[PDB]
Write a protein that binds this DNA or RNA. Structure first.
Ligand SMILES: [Mg+2]
Ligand SMILES: [Mg+2]
Ligand SMILES: [Mg+2]
Ligand SMILES: [Mg+2]
Ligand SMILES: [Zn+2]
Lengths: 56, 99, 144, 139, 158, 114
RNA sequence: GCGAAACAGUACCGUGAGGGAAAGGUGAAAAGAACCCAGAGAUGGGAGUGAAAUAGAUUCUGAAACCAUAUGCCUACAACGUGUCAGAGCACAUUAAUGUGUGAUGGCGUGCGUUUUGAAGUAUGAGCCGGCGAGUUAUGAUAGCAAGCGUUAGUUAACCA
RNA sequence: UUCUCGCAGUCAGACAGUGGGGGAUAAGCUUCAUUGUCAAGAGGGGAAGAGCCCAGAUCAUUAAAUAAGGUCCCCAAAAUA
RNA sequence: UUGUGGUAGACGAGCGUUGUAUUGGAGUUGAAGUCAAAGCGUGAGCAUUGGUGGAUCCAAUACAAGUGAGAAUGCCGGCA
């Protein structure tokens, strides 16, 4: 099944309205400073005041 | 105050000190033209026309209206004739009206 | 060329009205209502500015249809489904829903247009004498 | 006071780069470097480096304030394309076109920086009408 | 043309079943390989004819108008000599006779060689035997110097 | 001699495109569509340059009917009262404009009552 | 224009005969962009040479289709071959002009070529832009118009200088 | 609209009124004679219609009188008996 | 005064392009080409100013043609 008429530059742009991205939530790890995405462990390897990994 | 005047073939409602555009009058800039035909000068209605009544105007300028570019085109039948037109006009304003 | 015709624009001022549709007939009332809404009778009718007045119609159920129409002429309404014809009769319209009758009879008299749907909302058809639109201070005139 | 930075023919699509370039545009630089590092896109590892390079160019070269910076205007223009053939059923050989993107990021210092471009626009027509008028003296 | 181009008489596509144009041959006028359909050919004749008597009429009238136009100074054999192979003396003669910016034409009967040794490096001017002046070559002159002899010849030719 | 001539074609197409600006979508971009729309627009111009004097007269009639209906007579009776009695060539618009400056119009509508 | 302005009958297709392309230009001269910052690096941004680096090796000019950014105006009850004639409000200010951009709202409005008795067409062609592309030529015939020459007229061909 | 000379194009027609054939006084059927129109022709009426009625567009005018058709609203225009 | 709708189709007058010829003339104090602009023409079409660009070009009269593109399931390139 093919298009019978080309979908113009107007209909296409409207479809992509819902394609925009979301800014993912960001938290600031305590025990160092940086913006780790929230509910993860930052590159410190420290999650909260507990150690779960190596230096970076 | 007002008056109704037949200049060219169009009847105009005209007060003191108003500028209106009529069809070409063959009269150079700055001269005073006395439009002759008139009806309903001031509460005084001439039936055919108001006799011995004129409106005295000073011609301001001769101009050409905006271009009208008429193209006529029979559909699917070998015809695309084109023509352009710039109707000339004269803009003029009134000084006072002869009673 | 010539002096441009005068045409009011957003210079609209609209006064309410009241007509008590006691013993009038449907269509003769409806044309007068349609003209009053459109402002067709205004001395300065600009065809694109809703220069017309508001209107409130009272005692809708008392309006009368001449002849035997009360049992012979039907009003139809169709949903987009199949078998969705709802077919009601003049006697049943003068009892069950009377305001809808005058509303529809008025709307059809307006042009297929973009103010028609904005004109028609200037018609308030209460079924009975009482109303809650005494606040707007309407005038009152007979048979319009 | 713009201090842009451009990368040409990056092997990314123009239409995938425009999705994160929208995230970064208009926002301050402190909440751009990190917000762009943290997003899970191929179009982010390719713009974090470029944005940081633009930061460094602005700070060293032109000498702007830094913490007054903001990402003025972001795009991903179409870079040159590559054409390749792809086999198919029965040998029909469609053409795959690899895309590319000429990314460029501009970093302004003063909060407005937009009426100035309009000012240049208006000057470019003011001088045209002026040259037109000075040539009406053909009498 | 369509045929001389090193070209393929092979039909590029089958006539039908492949959805494309018909396109019989690769070297057609509308392809870009290019068979120029009509083009210019090396055989065009480019030649016009004029009755001899009409030509005598034209030459006679152009001589009549040019020879009464206050520039046709008559010349003698003497200054064809007394001008060495050098052209400087000829340029002095032109300058003194206020004939610099004109295009003066010398007409001669005996074809002297000192004269044409000069004026050859001059792009403006040129010397011709009587039998070598044409209607164009004469009505282009805008100034000419006839030698006194050729009149006797010219009157005979009308 | 060979002549290419890409100047003239582009200039002509540029004029056609410049004619159609403020057109939706591609109608101002592609020339093939721009020419169709310019032709059609000029057809509409030719038809409307006649329909508008067909319609303005109707509007004047309507706004004169409304004014006369509030004095006790209709427009279809007023025209007699201009032609046959007190022969007047007052135009069909100006008798309309005279309501926008009224109380000089009432002089008309009561003048023909004679 | 030779198929071919360059390492073209090359690369490539075909078992084979054979078929068979595309693309050139820095600047006057490399003075081919040492050095610094970011970066792993290409590269980019300053510096530097230079008349110009919007001439930077993507290298004369650099349209259009096309993809992104932005001032100004409109649009989320609306039936739309998408424009036109009227017309408000809004924002600006010109090849000085009854001016410019948008255009809530009214009236009106079934594309272009082709072929057909007749197509908006449920008949067909074109996805869009640019370029290329179709009544010429030789030698004779008749007719019209103009010119030279003329009442024992007019006129040269080949060839020769 | 007769005569001579150069130059073509055309030879698939359609419908409405009228008089008949074939047809079944069936066909938007077919074949003819005739009057128009369309083709090759727009505007108004017809709600919408190539072929009906009125008419026959040089272009502009935000001028006036009319033809067919029509006057409660849509849709401009009327009342009395 | 009579007219001026129009396909096929007959006839007339014309614009533009490329080059040659003679005649005038502009050009690094910025030529053509290219975009933009709120101009002028009855039409084909024609100017004016500014940015870019970095060397040829414009008008008048004749002459000669590879002379004028929206369609060929057109060819080539690019792009949706
Ligand atoms: Mg289809
Ligand atoms: Mg999606
Ligand atoms: Mg055509
Ligand atoms: Mg098909
Ligand atoms: Zn941390």
């Amino acid at each position: 099944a093919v298009q019978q008429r080309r979908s113009s530059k107007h209909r296409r742009d409207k479809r992509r309205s819902h394609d925009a991205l979301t800014a993912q939530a960001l938290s600031v790890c305590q025990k160092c400073g940086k913006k780790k995405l929230f509910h993860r462990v930052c590159s410190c390897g420290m999650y909260g005041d507990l150690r779960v990994k190596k230096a970076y | 105050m007002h008056a109704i005047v037949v200049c060219g073939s169009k009847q105009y409602l005209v007060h003191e000190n108003d500028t209106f555009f009529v069809e070409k009058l063959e009269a150079p800039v700055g001269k005073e033209i006395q439009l002759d035909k008139v009806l309903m000068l001031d509460e005084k209605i001439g039936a055919p026309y108001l006799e011995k009544a004129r409106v005295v105007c000073v011609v301001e300028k001769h101009g050409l209206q905006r271009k009208v570019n008429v193209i006529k085109h029979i559909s699917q039948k070998h015809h695309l004739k084109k023509y352009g037109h710039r109707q000339p006009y004269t803009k003029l304003k009134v000084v006072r009206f002869v009673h | 060329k010539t002096s441009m015709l005068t045409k009011e624009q957003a210079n609209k001022r609209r006064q309410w009205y009241i007509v008590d549709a006691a013993g009038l007939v449907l269509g003769k009332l409806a044309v007068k209502a349609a003209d009053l809404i459109r402002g067709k009778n205004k001395v300065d009718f600009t065809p694109n500015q809703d220069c017309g007045d508001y209107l409130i119609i009272i005692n809708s159920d008392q309006v009368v249809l001449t002849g035997n129409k009360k049992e012979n002429e039907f009003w139809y309404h169709h949903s987009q489904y199949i078998g969705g014809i709802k077919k009601v009769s003049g006697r049943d319209m003068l009892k069950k829903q009377s305001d809808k009758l005058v509303y529809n009879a008025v709307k059809g008299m307006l042009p297929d247009n973009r103010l028609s749907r904005r004109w028609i909302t200037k018609v308030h058809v209460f079924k009975g004498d009482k109303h809650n639109m005494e606040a707007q201070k309407p005038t009152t005139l007979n048979w319009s | 006071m713009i201090a842009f930075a451009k990368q040409f023919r990056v092997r990314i699509s123009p239409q995938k780069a425009r999705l994160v370039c929208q995230l970064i545009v208009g926002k301050k630089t402190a909440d751009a470097q990190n917000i762009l590092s943290n997003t899970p896109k191929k179009a982010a590892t390719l713009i974090a480096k470029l944005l940081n390079s633009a930061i460094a160019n602005a700070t060293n070269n032109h000498g702007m304030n830094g913490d007054a910076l903001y990402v003025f205007e972001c795009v991903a223009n179409q870079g040159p394309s590559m054409k390749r053939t792809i086999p198919r059923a029965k040998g029909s050989s469609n053409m795959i076109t690899k895309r590319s993107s000429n990314l460029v990021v501009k970093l302004s210092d003063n909060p407005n920086e937009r009426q100035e471009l309009i000012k240049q626009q208006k000057a470019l027509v003011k001088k045209r009408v002026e040259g037109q008028q000075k040539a009406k003296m053909a009498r | 043309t369509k045929g001389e181009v090193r070209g393929g008489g092979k039909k590029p596509y089958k006539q039908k079943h492949t959805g494309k144009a018909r396109q019989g041959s690769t070297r057609n006028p509308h392809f870009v390989g290019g068979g120029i359909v009509f083009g210019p050919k090396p055989n065009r004749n480019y030649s016009l004819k004029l009755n001899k008597k009409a030509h005598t009429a034209a030459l006679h009238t152009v001589w009549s108008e040019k020879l009464a136009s206050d520039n046709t100074h008559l010349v003698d054999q003497n200054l064809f000599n007394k001008t060495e192979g050098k052209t400087k003396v000829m340029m002095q003669f032109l300058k003194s006779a206020k004939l610099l910016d004109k295009n003066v034409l010398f007409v001669v009967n005996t074809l002297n060689t000192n004269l044409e040794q000069s004026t050859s490096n001059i792009k403006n001017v040129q010397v011709k035997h009587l039998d070598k002046v044409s209607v164009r070559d004469l009505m282009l002159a805008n100034a000419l110097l006839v030698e006194k002899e050729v009149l006797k010849a010219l009157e005979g030719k009308f | 001699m060979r002549i290419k001539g890409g100047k003239q074609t582009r200039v002509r197409r540029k004029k056609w495109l410049k004619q159609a600006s403020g057109s939706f979508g591609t109608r101002h971009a592609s020339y093939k569509v721009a020419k169709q729309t310019v032709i059609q627009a000029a057809k509409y111009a030719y038809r409307d340059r006649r329909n508008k004097k067909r319609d303005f007269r109707s509007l004047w009639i309507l706004r004169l009917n409304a004014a006369l209906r509030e004095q006790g007579m209709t427009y279809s009776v007023f025209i007699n009262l201009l032609k046959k009695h007190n022969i007047e060539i007052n135009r069909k618009v100006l008798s309309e404009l005279a309501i926008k400056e009224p109380s000089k119009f009432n002089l008309i509508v009561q003048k023909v009552k004679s």
